[PDB]
Enzyme design. Structure first.
Site, PDB file in Angstrom:
ATOM      1  N   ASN A   1      42.347  33.220  31.649  1.00 11.68           N
ATOM      2  CA  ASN A   1      41.130  33.151  32.449  1.00 11.68           C
ATOM      3  C   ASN A   1      39.903  33.619  31.673  1.00 11.68           C
ATOM      4  OD1 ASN A   1      42.909  35.577  32.947  1.00 11.68           O
ATOM      5  ND2 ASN A   1      41.012  36.350  33.863  1.00 11.68           N
TER       6      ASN A   1
ATOM      7  N   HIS B   1      48.107  43.630  32.468  1.00 11.38           N
ATOM      8  CA  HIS B   1      47.971  44.558  31.341  1.00 11.38           C
ATOM      9  C   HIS B   1      49.046  45.642  31.428  1.00 11.38           C
ATOM     10  CE1 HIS B   1      43.463  43.261  31.389  1.00 11.38           C
ATOM     11  NE2 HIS B   1      44.246  42.322  30.889  1.00 11.38           N
TER      12      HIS B   1
ATOM     13  N   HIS C   1      46.767  41.340  40.021  1.00 14.55           N
ATOM     14  CA  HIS C   1      47.126  39.918  39.993  1.00 14.55           C
ATOM     15  C   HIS C   1      48.449  39.635  40.707  1.00 14.55           C
ATOM     16  CE1 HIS C   1      43.758  39.665  37.350  1.00 14.55           C
ATOM     17  NE2 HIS C   1      44.359  40.338  36.385  1.00 14.55           N
TER      18      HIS C   1
ATOM     19  N   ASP D   1      43.810  34.951  26.954  1.00 19.46           N
ATOM     20  CA  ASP D   1      42.935  36.122  26.930  1.00 19.46           C
ATOM     21  C   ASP D   1      42.830  36.654  25.504  1.00 19.46           C
ATOM     22  OD1 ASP D   1      42.508  35.786  29.594  1.00 19.46           O
ATOM     23  OD2 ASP D   1      43.452  37.659  30.283  1.00 19.46           O
TER      24      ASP D   1
END
Ligand SMILES: *[C@@H]1O[C@H](CO)[C@@H](O[C@@H]2O[C@H](CO)[C@@H](O)[C@H](O)[C@H]2NC(C)=O)[C@H](O)[C@H]1NC(C)=O
Ligand SMILES: *[C@@H]1O[C@H](CO)[C@@H](O)[C@H](O)[C@H]1NC(C)=O
Ligand SMILES: *[C@@H]1O[C@H](CO)[C@@H](O)[C@H](O)[C@H]1NC(C)=O
Ligand SMILES: *[C@@H]1O[C@H](CO)[C@@H](O)[C@H](O)[C@H]1NC(C)=O
Ligand SMILES: *[C@@H]1O[C@H](CO)[C@@H](O)[C@H](O)[C@H]1NC(C)=O
Ligand SMILES: *[C@@H]1O[C@H](CO)[C@@H](O)[C@H](O)[C@H]1NC(C)=O
Ligand SMILES: [Fe+3]
Ligand SMILES: [Fe+3]
Length: 504
Positions: free
Chosen positions: A254, A375, A346, A197
């Site tokens: 992702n 995060h 997630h 990311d």
């Protein structure tokens, strides 16, 4: 001294709670600061062994808009001159050049094509040594870089370690990112690991409009999950003071999928960074391994086939079988998606990867796992198959690099916050592996009703971590929160102690 894992697992701690703004394209740090074919976005990467390293850069501006015309990579050479002193760059290496495009076959969507990307591998380097270098095309006036320098990893051995390894994930390119990177650079790391990311270019439409959440804003009103590829160039430009002086190893997350024409994926990620894919015999940009002193690092792909029958798993079996733990005592892995995160975001999303690979890694005595994706910051107690286990790896998630997406604050164990099981699996990779627990305090349920005992520490803050391996048995881990700026500030700190006679 701080706590250490020798004490056994600690009682879970949750730090009580207290968007980021993307850097504008007018920020001087992201603008093109060179002209013509002079190198920009200069970055160093490790090879598989300390005696070799990669230097990469881009020459030429990108194109964004109408009838983009991809550049001929064969028109600008790929040369690095290097040496042990800034005034004696007497060694020379040459490499390859390529371009990539980001093309969408939908009316209204704008196309992109890159500057010329260069990758040059430097051979025959001394370990633990500073090298000065300049890159570019010496046959083109003004097309050579300024002199830069980096230091190779120390020689491979059980008492030889890089001083400090920085670990970050999900950086994006916000003002909070600049805080993360500034904190990290002030700790003077010998090596940066970036756990997926990277630029969050895919939070933008192709015409440069951004959002804090694509699925919220544009997913229903766009024909594909678009990107604004220039964010990668802004990112590479912003990071150059670090990447040109400090090796940086990236693995995909992702947000690197960036699906485009013909179902092509990962074009930007695959082209922009150097990976030791050939040297470590993965022959893939998505997973690979390398040695840094007495640490054997494995970067794994949460977004390439990880099943027990696939190519990645076969490669991993061979890679692990070649590791001699008296030569590289530390076995450390990184990949994007956490296996033991306790946030709602997630939650259990990578369960199929855990089921595929955890037993293999446990059987080879994996010491530490670093991930991103979530995060927030979290550190697990030593754990194997959801069981506290003195021979299980410590799982640390640092996907809190500061991108503009919302921070993970809700916990799956928060009252009424347990997600529906069928809503968890990663859609891109598919499969479903997350079943209710059959033992332990949460037996019968999908989540706990309090912080799981395998979670040692969790905090919803941006920051970065530093790993300081001391010798064959002790490594000091420090995680630093961004909002703490005073000297010596540390949010979480523990000695990770391995016991090879116990577990190997
Ligand atoms: C490996 O490094 C660790 C940490 O530096 C050593 O443990 C420390 O040793 C000093 C001197 O005895 C003590 O004052 C510290 O309190 C110890 N810290 C911890 C967390 O235990 C360890 O002895 C070293 N092991 C080897 C084989 O050299
Ligand atoms: C972008 O590239 C694709 C593939 O070449 C093409 O089909 C499309 O028309 C292009 N769009 C524009 C605005 O040039
Ligand atoms: C991100 O940066 C802004 C501005 O510096 C700051 O106010 C905010 O607290 C930061 N967010 C976090 C989670 O630290
Ligand atoms: C880009 O196009 C979208 C609609 O597709 C629009 O809402 C947005 O305001 C435009 N952004 C820019 C920088 O033109
Ligand atoms: C993990 O725990 C589950 C449930 O108890 C068990 O069925 C499974 O075999 C275990 N996996 C390994 C690799 O031991
Ligand atoms: C699994 O646990 C959840 C609660 O976390 C519960 O709603 C669900 O019915 C359970 N499913 C099975 C098969 O037990
Ligand atoms: Fe992310
Ligand atoms: Fe992610």
């Amino acid at each position: 001294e701080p706590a250490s894992t020798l004490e056994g697992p600690s009682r879970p701690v949750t730090v009580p709670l207290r968007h980021a703004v993307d850097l504008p394209d007018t920020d001087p740090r992201v603008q093109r600061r060179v002209t013509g074919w002079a190198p920009e976005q200069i970055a160093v990467a490790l090879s598989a062994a300390p005696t070799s390293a990669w230097v990469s850069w881009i020459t030429g501006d990108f194109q964004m808009g109408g009838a983009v015309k991809p550049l001929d990579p064969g028109t600008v050479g790929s040369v690095v001159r290097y040496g042990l002193a800034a005034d004696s760059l007497v060694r020379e290496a040459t490499g390859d050049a390529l371009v990539y495009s980001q093309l969408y076959p939908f009316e209204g969507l704008q196309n992109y094509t890159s500057g010329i990307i260069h990758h040059v591998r430097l051979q025959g380097l001394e370990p633990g040594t500073k090298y000065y270098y300049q890159c570019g095309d010496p046959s083109i006036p003004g097309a050579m870089s300024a002199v830069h320098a980096f230091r190779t990893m120390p020689a491979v051995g059980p008492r030889s370690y890089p001083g400090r390894i920085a670990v970050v994930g999900d950086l994006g390119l916000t003002y909070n990112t600049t805080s993360t990177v500034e904190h990290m650079a002030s700790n003077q790391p010998d090596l940066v690991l970036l756990l997926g990311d990277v630029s969050y270019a895919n939070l933008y439409l192709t015409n440069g409009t951004g959002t804090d959440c694509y699925s919220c804003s544009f997913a229903k009103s766009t024909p594909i999950h678009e990107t604004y590829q220039p964010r990668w160039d802004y990112w590479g430009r912003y990071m150059e003071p670090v990447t040109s002086s400090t090796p940086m190893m990236v693995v995909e997350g992702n947000h690197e999928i960036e699906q485009q024409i013909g179902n092509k994926t990962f074009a930007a990620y695959s082209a922009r960074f150097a990976f030791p894919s050939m040297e470590s015999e993965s022959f893939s940009p998505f997973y690979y391994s390398f040695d840094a002193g007495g640490i054997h690092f494995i970067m794994l792909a949460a977004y390439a086939d990880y099943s027990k029958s696939g190519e990645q798993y076969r490669w991993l079996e061979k890679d692990l079988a070649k590791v001699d733990r008296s030569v590289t005592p530390w076995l450390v892995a990184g990949w994007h998606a956490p296996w033991y995160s306790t946030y709602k975001a997630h939650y259990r999303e990578a369960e199929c990867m855990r089921v595929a690979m955890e037993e293999l890694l446990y059987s080879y005595g994996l010491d530490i796992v670093f991930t991103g994706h979530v995060h927030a910051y979290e550190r697990s107690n030593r754990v194997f198959n959801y069981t506290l286990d003195p021979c299980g790896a410590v799982h640390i998630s640092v996907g809190d690099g500061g991108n503009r997406e919302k921070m993970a604050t809700t916990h799956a164990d928060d009252p009424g916050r347990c997600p529906e099981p069928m809503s968890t699996p990663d859609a891109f990779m598919g499969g479903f592996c997350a079943f209710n627990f059959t033992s332990g305090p949460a037996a019968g349920s999908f989540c706990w009703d309090r912080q799981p005992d395998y979670s040692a520490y969790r905090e919803s803050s941006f920051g970065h971590g530093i790993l300081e391996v001391k010798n064959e048995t002790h490594a000091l881990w420090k995680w630093h929160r961004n909002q703490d700026l005073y000297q010596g500030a540390v949010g979480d700190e523990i000695y990770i102690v391995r016991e090879p006679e116990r577990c190997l």
